[PDB]
């Protein structure tokens, strides 16, 4: 019951300290892209990011209390959602660009380098513009990313007290988002409206993950890119 006892400020504190590092791409900026090379860069980056995502998840309050099986299920369900909200967040201050890494900032026209990809880039860019429009804050971001982890696979779960604990932890994160808003001086009405605005983003994030997973899968099949064993496994979980 360690995670239920955290205060709002301690929740934010723990989420901030659990943040993964921003990784660089193995991309050299004197070489043009091809469909193969770009898919290679994006997935290579993602594969390295997944390892750090596991350490982050284990630091999300309440997550280490869940069984290994349940932990696995939640990460398998949410992994690309989690990569995408990170992407969208770090692209927030780069209108019209997706900052995959600090040395790999891609425009929408560069999404056209991979078949069926610019449509996904456009969705990611629109979500990023929404973040910018809302003036989304860093403390709110880490809250939202933690909610995705805990929520996306939560109904695919006899130990029913696992589901209940996880729902308590979700409630704490809601309380934490509200705390942040009250602290910034929003009126009650504004807190409630903003909480809803932030949570509706997660429907859009889920959509982009499902499309992204269809695309990655299409890329795997026609062999445009060889994927790591981890990625093939993370991908196999969705079909």
């Amino acid at each position: 019951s360690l995670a239920l006892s955290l205060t709002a400020d301690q929740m934010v504190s723990a989420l901030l300290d659990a943040e993964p590092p921003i990784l660089y791409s193995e991309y050299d900026p004197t070489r043009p892209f091809s469909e193969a090379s770009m898919m290679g860069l994006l997935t290579n980056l993602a594969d390295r990011e997944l390892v750090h995502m596991i350490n982050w998840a284990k630091r999300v309050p309440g997550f280490v209390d869940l069984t290994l099986h349940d932990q696995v299920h939640l990460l398998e369900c949410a992994w690309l959602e989690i990569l995408m909200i990170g992407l969208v967040w770090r692209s927030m201050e780069h209108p019209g660009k997706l900052l995959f890494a600090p040395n790999l900032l891609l425009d929408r026209n560069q999404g056209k380098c991979v078949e069926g990809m610019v449509e996904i880039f456009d969705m990611l860019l629109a979500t990023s513009s929404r973040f910018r429009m809302m003036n989304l804050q860093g403390e709110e971001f880490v809250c939202l990313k933690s909610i995705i982890l805990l929520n996306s696979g939560v109904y695919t779960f006899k130990s029913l007290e696992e589901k209940d604990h996880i729902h308590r932890v979700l409630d704490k994160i809601t309380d934490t988002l509200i705390h942040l808003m009250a602290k910034a001086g929003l009126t009650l009405q504004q807190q409630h409206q903003r909480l809803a605005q932030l949570l509706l983003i997660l429907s859009h994030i889920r959509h982009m993950s499902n499309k992204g997973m269809e695309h990655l899968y299409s890329m795997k099949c026609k062999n445009v890119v060889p994927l790591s064993d981890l990625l093939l496994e993370m991908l196999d979980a969705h079909r």
């Binding site: 596991i54 350490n55 284990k58 290994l68 696995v72 398998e76 981890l230």
Partner: peptide
Amino acid sequence: HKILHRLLQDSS
């Protein structure tokens, strides 16, 4: 022998 399983047990 899922990689994820092993990463989770070996997490830092």
